Design a protein around this ligand. Structure first.
Ligand code: AW3
Length: 326
């Protein structure tokens, strides 16, 4: 019963892999997960990087010597920390690079049968990462991913921000089931690397439900991957966003209002009367399954647009101009 073990850099239980090393899917396997874990612990601790592809992933002896050599170096770093050298700060957030590794790792150990999940169908990782940098978030914020799937986006944002809470809501059974495991695997692996995350919850639910009406209303940052949603769903979401508070934000893959919205007597009731909508800077090189470069849209709840329209109706000069155009 042959095995490979990697020690945690902060003394959690070791990662143990059987030999021969499992394959996770067409592009991922345990051997590369091991190599990349070592790579990433080395980025996490430069003394280790100091001490550390001429390796044969199909040879037990070659892979055992890699793991033994990492494990020795870890022991020696733990000794160094007992001395005068300061240990690695705990309670930090993972870098974007490490987080990407962690999420792949969590996925590798959580979604055993990809196929079961495919029948409900991560360049998104980079897009979300850009959004985390642009959309400033604080501990006043509540975050939701509407239609969260197996939960990856919620995990990523929770690892990276100070929002008071992060939620994902998913209706379908397969993805909700896998999210429970993703959650367990995520907490285990974040502990393994010694890294912190903000609070989060993954839930089974319908975000168009009556419970979610009030919850949407109290959320300050919503992400929603709506490009492929149909008009009735989008229409129903527009109605839930109408109760959001001023400064609330929605980031989506298809805008919920025209980018050039001109308020007038016929469109007074439209969601565009209460939000600024902008097309966000796209990430060079990122392209959708449609071939085009990706785009995403930021909506900010701003009721001063509506206020100014009403004020303008009181001004006979402005009222005439408006009336003459339309
Ligand atoms: C814009 C940026 C780039 C920032 C951005 C990038 C990514 C994200 N977020 C994600 O990709 N999340 C995971 C994949 C999308 N989820 C599809 C899931 O929706 C579920 N769903 C549908 C209804 Br309709 C639905 C519902 N009514 N109630 C609950 N779940 C629902 C459906 O069962 C699928 O499992 C958000 C923003």
């Amino acid at each position: 019963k042959l095995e490979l073990r990697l020690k945690s850099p902060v003394g959690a239980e070791p990662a143990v892999y059987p030999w021969p090393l499992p394959v996770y899917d067409k592009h991922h396997d345990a051997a590369h997960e091991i190599i990349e874990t070592i790579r990433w612990v080395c980025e996490e601790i430069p003394d280790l990087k100091l001490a550390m592809i001429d390796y044969d992933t199909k040879s037990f002896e070659s892979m055992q010597r890699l793991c033994d050599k990492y494990n020795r170096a870890i022991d020696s770093i733990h000794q160094l920390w007992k001395g005068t050298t300061q240990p690695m700060k705990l309670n930090t957030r993972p870098s974007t690079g490490l987080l990407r590794h962690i999420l792949q790792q969590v996925y590798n150990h959580s979604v055993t049968d990809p196929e079961k999940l495919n029948n409900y169908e991560e360049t998104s990782f980079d897009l979300v990462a850009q959004m985390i940098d642009e959309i400033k978030m604080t501990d006043d914020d509540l975050f939701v991913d509407l239609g969260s799937g197996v939960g990856q986006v919620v995990l990523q944002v929770a690892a990276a921000t100070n929002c008071k809470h992060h939620y994902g809501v998913e209706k379908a059974d397969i993805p909700a089931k896998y999210a429970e495991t993703m959650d367990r695997e995520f907490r285990k692996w974040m502990k393994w690397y010694g890294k912190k995350h903000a609070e989060y919850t993954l839930e089974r639910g319908d975000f168009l439900s009556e419970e979610w009406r009030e919850r949407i209303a109290n959320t300050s940052v919503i992400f929603v991957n709506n490009f492929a949603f149909g008009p009735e769903v989008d229409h129903q979401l527009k109605e839930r966003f109408a109760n959001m508070k001023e400064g609330g934000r929605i980031v989506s893959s298809k805008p919920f209002a025209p980018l050039n919205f001109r308020i007038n007597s016929r469109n007074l009731s439209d969601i565009g009367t209460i939000m600024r909508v902008v097309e966000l800077s796209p990430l060079k090189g990122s392209v959708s399954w449609t071939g085009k470069p990706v785009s995403y849209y930021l909506h900010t709840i701003d009721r001063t647009i509506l206020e100014n329209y009403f004020s303008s109706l009181k001004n006979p000069k402005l009222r005439e101009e408006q009336e003459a155009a339309r």
